[PDB]
Design a protein around this ligand. Structure first.
Ligand SMILES: Nc1ncnc2c1ncn2[C@@H]1O[C@H](COP(=O)(O)OP(=O)(O)OP(O)(O)=S)[C@@H](O)[C@H]1O
Ligand SMILES: Nc1ncnc2c1ncn2[C@@H]1O[C@H](COP(=O)(O)OP(=O)(O)OP(O)(O)=S)[C@@H](O)[C@H]1O
Ligand SMILES: Nc1ncnc2c1ncn2[C@@H]1O[C@H](COP(=O)(O)OP(=O)(O)OP(O)(O)=S)[C@@H](O)[C@H]1O
Ligand SMILES: [Mg+2]
Ligand SMILES: [Mg+2]
Ligand SMILES: [Mg+2]
Lengths: 728, 479
């Protein structure tokens, strides 16, 4: 019925108003790629735009831009009425006026900087009373046509004249400020945004339906993550993208009030939220007002916590009130708050990955003008511990550095510079490099949950263990039907043992990469220092974090350091089991089987590994990684020399047959020494840029073997008899 | 309400408590329910303000002011019973204590039925399967799961339901049914709250899951079933039944399975405490936790308290000889104290298991604590056939597979080794199926290939040493 209704959701094209439909839709609605379409919304208003051909979007959805989302007064998830408009349009006169809320501080002829290089080669349609956003000059202003030929009958054409007036019109309350934060202002958190939408917008957008059904709405969403990850930004965006009254409660602001006055503020906020329609209560920095009652001094703080608990428990389904909270220290929150009925849904806003931080960089530089040498992908790759706030600071510092070199072209005597020079100031890649040079990443110490970049091409040889790892990891996560057909529960653990430098870490990272699963690396020294504070909850948090990242691989590297804390199995007579290892075994035994978490351990001291690790059900897949043989050495050398300009005369198989007991690390050291000799040759010749055969010969002259023959024999002995271990 | 009372101003919460008690006394027989009692009455040793202590004292006075003529019953709920002030749990204030534990599979199935009886379920909905697949869930967790499944069902019905319409009619609402796929999706992303909680339940593994070991099965039956089923014979012949059994032998020979199966046959509660668990739970210097374990076992009588992997406990300080010091530390002394201090008439049975009989401390083996020394050896020829048959019950084994041939081709293999062989053969079959996809019967060739790479997890010297300890372990204590 009525094949003209479209579901409204945010678009992905980072441009002006351009709607995107699915493959069957443009054929069903007989419109082509470059066609003019008409959008009809509520409150008797229209919008005109140009469609885009998309296939991999969805089965039935339109894509709606935020620029003209407010033009139709429609929010996310709304239903729109489309209509093809095969009417030829051409503009003759379009009286256009900005709004004096975002154009303050800009002078001069704004057309040649903002409107001229935005109209041509676009051919966009303009309707009566359209508010379209134009970026440029390191700021964004929205623009408004107020008078033209009868609506719409207008497209962007070179034959359209324009004239400035110099008196921008004020903004009325009928429209929402486009300068406010929306869904498009958040980068690197789309899964979290999807969860928040699914848990929030349906009850809020349809309060009557949710009241009619009589089902429990999630009213205890709790955002948490490292500081500066955009928790407040996400909450404000969710508030703005829905027609829900938003009441903001600040932790420190409440705590700064006098005793007996903060409780009044909390009660007033909850009363306002209950009274005013569906509403969202956001309590930023929840740990400020509600820490653990076991660790708190004053009775006023405990009164505050009890009042918050009472207010949370006094929430009814009929109230249609959703309480959201943000905290960078989730473990400091009082446990009574995180129970059922108060804060049950927990959303982890983690550190963005490379793609996410690239998206954040684009979001923060979309206002700025970038020089042609600016490679935002390179900047994202070079920033590891940065968060959204860190990237915003980096972009601001780059802009300030660009200004600092433009103090002469900009008349500092002049009160308010004009935009014809501001756009001429462009941020170079050198400015970004300088800003990145002096920047302090806040999330350096945070554990990384990400898909590693190293693939099988970075590993030479080891084909059999590659196949075994594929069968152990990919198959249970890709074909569960075969496993339940044959009745075998997949093994959840693998232990890597062998001589050092043979690729135990690379194998785990590569198998994580191939499955496209999250990878968490916990090293033995890290465990030994993180337990020295007697914090038993940290290694539990590691397993909890791995649980939410399923499918995930939890890799414990350098287990020898853990096993060497108390000497080993024999040692002086005592056992090496202490501290973390018992809790690690407990966590391994207490993890759900249906969860897709895979645990991999690595050690180059199989003699001192404690037997309880090897028990079936914890780590029973014993995989032995030996020293590379002749062909594996060739493969390792080729893998290590992918990034270097190796000369043609270099015989890699000759080097492989000249090295017998060398491991992968030894071959990497040989390659690095040869490259360093080449660098020295280049430096000397400066006062040629191809690493040669002679460099490899000289490096091989000083090449050293890092595994003894007796060590090889002992590893071969353990390669055959390690399942025994446990028992005596 | 605990928090609601505590949120009031100083001197106003006491008025509320007094008013509540006066109303209860005045209005006929009545029930006073104090939800979250730990909110208002924590331990007075661990509390800061004097207003909180006034609240606790007022509650104690009100509880003590209760007369039989008042016909007033005071009920309280707390998820942290140990945080309650001890003065409240004495006689006259809170003497009856009821433990609302985590529901079992049948209980959580009943909860799922109670929460879905309003919803409409599709014909493929197997609530029993959902109950089996939820382990750490509680009633609130299952209610949340059902609500999430209903919401997922709605989310796929947003077009059939006119979202423009203010109040949808029931002729379409009933047409919306919750599929088993929706329940699977809801279960996929769900956080069980009671995962860390200790489980007190009857295990599912029966004697059919154990191959061979007939003699120890009979001995365990005589040791456990008879005192709980025929006390009259025991009091007639005058012998007090032994309350403890220690399992020792090579690893992977079925020590845990035996304890679980004997728990299952008696239909008694089973509590499993592993050595690593004890070692981490004591590292916080919490001596009351292992006492709570015995207390929890006491209320579950008839119950079996199983301490698995005692070698990890004994390896904390090296062992009996080690470098010269003793392995007795931390939990083991308190475990011995609890074993000596438990009532004989209680039906609690204690079973210990270890694969390091050399380093087990002698005090464990003293009569009255664990004096029934049962040795579980490596399976022999027929026991290997039985183990293979038990492990291959759930797999579609082809007819040409000769299990006795595999049993005679494996001599020093334990039960875990045979399970590993079966798993490797099944994994080869899975690989064959995957390759053929780009047949669903595990064949003789798969078993041959698995046996090619089969490995032995117990050494011959280890077998000799275990045989030596199998004969001389009662001695141990003394020198
Ligand atoms: N994911 C993101 N996408 C875009 N901008 C971001 C993102 N995260 C942070 N920012 C920027 O960094 C600023 C700081 O983020 P906030 O949300 O204010 O910090 P926070 O998340 O509340 O963490 P706190 O307050 O320090 S505990 C935001 O106002 C944005 O300008
Ligand atoms: N198969 C391999 N192919 C290529 N490079 C390898 C290989 N094995 C080792 N390497 C090199 O050796 C380095 C160390 O790799 P790892 O996986 O950490 O070795 P490992 O077995 O974990 O022993 P350590 O203690 O970490 S050196 C890698 O960064 C490579 O440069
Ligand atoms: N008699 C048996 N029949 C069938 N399977 C057995 C038998 N004994 C051992 N197994 C297998 O071995 C696994 C381990 O069983 P357990 O009872 O834990 O052995 P264990 O003697 O306790 O030694 P560990 O340290 O636990 S491997 C079981 O899950 C079975 O797969
Ligand atoms: Mg904040
Ligand atoms: Mg490593
Ligand atoms: Mg066991």
């Amino acid at each position: 019925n009525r094949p003209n209704r479209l579901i409204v959701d945010e678009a992905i094209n980072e441009d002006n108003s351009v709607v995107s439909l699915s493959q069957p839709k443009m054929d069903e609605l007989q419109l082509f790629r470059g066609d003019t379409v008409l959008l009809k919304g509520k409150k008797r208003r229209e919008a005109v735009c140009i469609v885009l051909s998309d296939d991999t979007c969805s089965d039935e959805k339109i894509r709606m831009n935020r620029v003209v989302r407010n033009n139709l007064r429609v929010r996310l998830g709304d239903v729109i009425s489309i209509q093809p408009c095969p009417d030829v349009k051409y503009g003759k006169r379009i009286h256009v006026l900005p709004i004096d809320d975002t154009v303050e501080g800009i002078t001069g002829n704004l057309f040649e900087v903002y409107l001229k290089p935005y109209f041509l080669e676009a051919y966009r349609p303009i309707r009566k009373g359209d508010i379209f956003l134009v970026r440029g000059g390191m700021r964004a202003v929205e623009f408004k046509v107020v008078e033209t030929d009868p609506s719409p009958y207008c497209i962007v054409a070179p034959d359209t004249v324009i004239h400035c007036e110099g008196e921008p019109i004020k903004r009325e309350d009928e429209e929402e400020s486009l300068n406010e934060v929306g869904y498009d202002d958040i980068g690197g958190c789309r899964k979290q945004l999807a969860q928040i939408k699914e848990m929030v917008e349906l009850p809020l957008r349809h309060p009557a339906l949710f009241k009619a059904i009589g089902v429990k709405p999630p009213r205890g969403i709790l955002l948490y993550g490292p500081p500066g990850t955009g928790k407040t930004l996400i909450a404000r965006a969710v508030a703005n993208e829905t027609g829900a009254f938003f009441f903001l409660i600040n932790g420190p602001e409440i705590m700064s009030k006098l005793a007996g006055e903060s409780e009044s503020n909390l009660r007033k906020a909850f009363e306002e939220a209950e009274k005013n329609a569906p509403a969202i209560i956001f309590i930023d920095e929840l740990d400020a007002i509600a820490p653990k009652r076991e660790k708190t001094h004053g009775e006023v703080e405990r009164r505050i916590v009890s009042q918050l608990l009472t207010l949370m428990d006094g929430l009814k389904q009929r109230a249609h009130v959703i309480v959201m909270a943000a905290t960078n220290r989730p473990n400091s929150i009082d446990p009574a708050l995180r129970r059922f009925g108060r804060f049950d849904r927990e959303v982890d806003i983690g550190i963005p990955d490379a793609t996410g931080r690239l998206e954040i960089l684009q979001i923060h530089t979309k206002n700025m003008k970038l020089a042609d040498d600016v490679d935002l992908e390179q900047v994202a790759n070079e920033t590891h511990g940065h968060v959204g706030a860190d990237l915003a600071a980096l972009c601001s510092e780059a802009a300030l550095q660009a200004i600092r070199k433009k103090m002469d072209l900009i008349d500092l005597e002049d009160e308010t510079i004009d935009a014809e020079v501001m756009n001429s100031l462009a941020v170079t890649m050198d400015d970004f490099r300088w800003a990145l040079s002096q920047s302090n990443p806040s999330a350096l110490r945070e554990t990384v949950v990400d898909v590693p970049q190293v693939t099988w091409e970075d590993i030479g040889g080891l084909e059999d263990v590659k196949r075994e790892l594929q069968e152990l990891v990919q198959y249970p996560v890709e074909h569960p039907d075969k496993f339940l057909k044959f009745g075998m529960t997949p093994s959840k653990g693998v232990l890597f043992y062998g001589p050092p430098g043979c690729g135990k870490t690379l194998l785990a990272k590569a198998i994580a990469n191939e499955c496209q699963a999250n990878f968490i690396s916990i090293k033995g020294p890290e465990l030994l220092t993180m337990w020295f504070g007697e914090s038993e909850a940290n290694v539990r948090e590691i397993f909890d974090k791995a649980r939410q990242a399923a499918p995930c691989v939890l890799f414990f590297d350098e287990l020898d350091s853990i096993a060497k804390a108390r000497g080993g199995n024999i040692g002086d007579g005592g056992g090496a089991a202490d501290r973390v290892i018992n809790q690690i075994l407990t966590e391994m035994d207490g993890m759900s089987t249906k969860k897709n978490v895979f645990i991999i351990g690595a050690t180059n001291r199989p003699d001192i590994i404690d037997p309880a690790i090897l028990r079936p059900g914890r780590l029973d897949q014993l995989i032995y990684i030996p020293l590379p043989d002749e062909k594996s050495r060739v493969a390792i050398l080729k893998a290590n020399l992918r990034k270097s300009p190796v000369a043609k005369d270099v015989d890699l198989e000759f080097l492989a047959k000249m090295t017998n007991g060398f491991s992968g690390a030894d071959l990497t050291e040989i390659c690095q020494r040869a490259c360093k000799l080449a660098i020295r040759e280049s430096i000397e010749s400066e006062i040629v840029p191809e690493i040669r055969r002679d460099h490899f010969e000289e490096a091989m002259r000083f090449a050293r073997r890092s595994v003894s023959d007796n060590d090889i024999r002992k590893y071969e002995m353990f390669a055959q008899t390690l399942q025994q271990s446990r028992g005596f």
